[PDB]
Amino acid sequence: MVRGIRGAITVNSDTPTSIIIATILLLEKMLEANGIQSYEELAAVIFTVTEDLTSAFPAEAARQIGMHRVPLLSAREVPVPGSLPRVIRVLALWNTDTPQDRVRHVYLSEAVRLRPD
Amino acid sequence: KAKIGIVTVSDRASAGITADISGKAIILALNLYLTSEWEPIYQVIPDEQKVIERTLIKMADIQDCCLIVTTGGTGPAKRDVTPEATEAVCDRMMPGFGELMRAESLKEVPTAILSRQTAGLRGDSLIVNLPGDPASISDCLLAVFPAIPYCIDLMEGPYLECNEAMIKPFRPK
Numbered sequence: 001m002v003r004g005i006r007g008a009i010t011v012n013s014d015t016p017t018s019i020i021i022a023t024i025l026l027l028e029k030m031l032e033a034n035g036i037q038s039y040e041e042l043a044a045v046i047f048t049v050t051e052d053l054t055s056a057f058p059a060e061a062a063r064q065i066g067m068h069r070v071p072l073l074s075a076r077e078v079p080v081p082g083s084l085p086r087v088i089r090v091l092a093l094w095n096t097d098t099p100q101d102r103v104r105h106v107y108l109s110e111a112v113r114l115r116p117d
Numbered sequence: 118k119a120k121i122g123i124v125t126v127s128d129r130a131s132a133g134i135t136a137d138i139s140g141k142a143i144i145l146a147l148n149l150y151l152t153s154e155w156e157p158i159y160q161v162i163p164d165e166q167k168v169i170e171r172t173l174i175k176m177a178d179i180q181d182c183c184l185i186v187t188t189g190g191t192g193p194a195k196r197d198v199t200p201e202a203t204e205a206v207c208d209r210m211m212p213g214f215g216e217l218m219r220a221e222s223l224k225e226v227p228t229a230i231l232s233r234q235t236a237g238l239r240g241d242s243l244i245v246n247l248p249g250d251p252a253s254i255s256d257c258l259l260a261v262f263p264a265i266p267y268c269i270d271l272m273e274g275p276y277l278e279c280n281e282a283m284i285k286p287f288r289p290k
Contacts, residue, residue, distance in 0.1 A: 010252070011252075011255070012225070012252055012253065012255070012256050013255075013256050015255070015256075015259060016282065016283055017146055017149050017150075017255055017259055017283050017284065018255040018256065018259070020145075020149060021142055021145045021146060021149070021255055022255075024145055025138070025141070025142065025145075025251075064148075064149075109251075109252050110252075
């Protein structure tokens with residue numbers, strides 16, 4: 001019994017500092033918005049970045065906040081022309097029995113335009 | 118051990134309505150920049166000029182902060198009075214900081230000329246104004262910090278040491 005948590009955030013530039021900070025902020029807001037106490041509830045966390053973000057792996061942000069024992073994997077987002085630039089997307093696999101409609105998903109900064117809810 | 122001040126100027130934040138975020142990003146950025154030992158002095162205060170003046174003075178004169186970083190209230194709105202509070206507590210102004218942050222944001226947003234951010238020195242403490250928008254804090258802090266450790270050197274302050282993978286400061290020999 002697993003539920004996916006989706007997250008997204010943008011950055012103004014492709015710098016290692018800005019990528020890590022934004023991922024730390026996003027990751028911690030998806031955890032708070034679902035009342036997740038310990039990292040041991042996470043089966044894995046998957047990241048995607050757009051073509052214009054290459055200066056750092058988003059996985060370093062998880063180790064920056066103590067997710068050394070959490071499996072992480074990153075990949076490249078589909079380069080759709082005209083889509084939102086410099087987006088870091090997250091799919092966290094949450095070990096819980098929470099109903100689907102009660103899982104809270106977090107879209108931050110310019111990435112709020114991605115979902116109209 | 119070095120001490121760095123972080124001042125968030127926001128009415129809604131200090132009242133408890135909204136979370137800081139902007140101050141959190143500044144502290145996260147400093148943790149990525151610095152490898153040497155440092156201690157954050159963090160304050161959230163409303164948009165009252167006299168409160169900002171006292172908060173900067175306490176951090177610089179009482180708590181011995183070699184660098185104080187502010188976020189919020191640097192625009193043309195009526196309640197935006199952070200630049201005036203910074204000029205009040207500083208005996209000397211650093212005009213190069215304000216010029217650079219506007220020149221970098223001007224590459225992207227034309228309204229960067231509406232920014233009134235500035236920077237100055239109170240004794241041997243450096244005070245720098247950052248924007249209120251959390252998205253702009255990383256880019257703005259990253260543009261000026263390469264010069265900050267050498268500035269604190271010239272003021273006979275702590276020797277800040279940086280992670281060269283996150284930011285590369287400049288120091289002549």
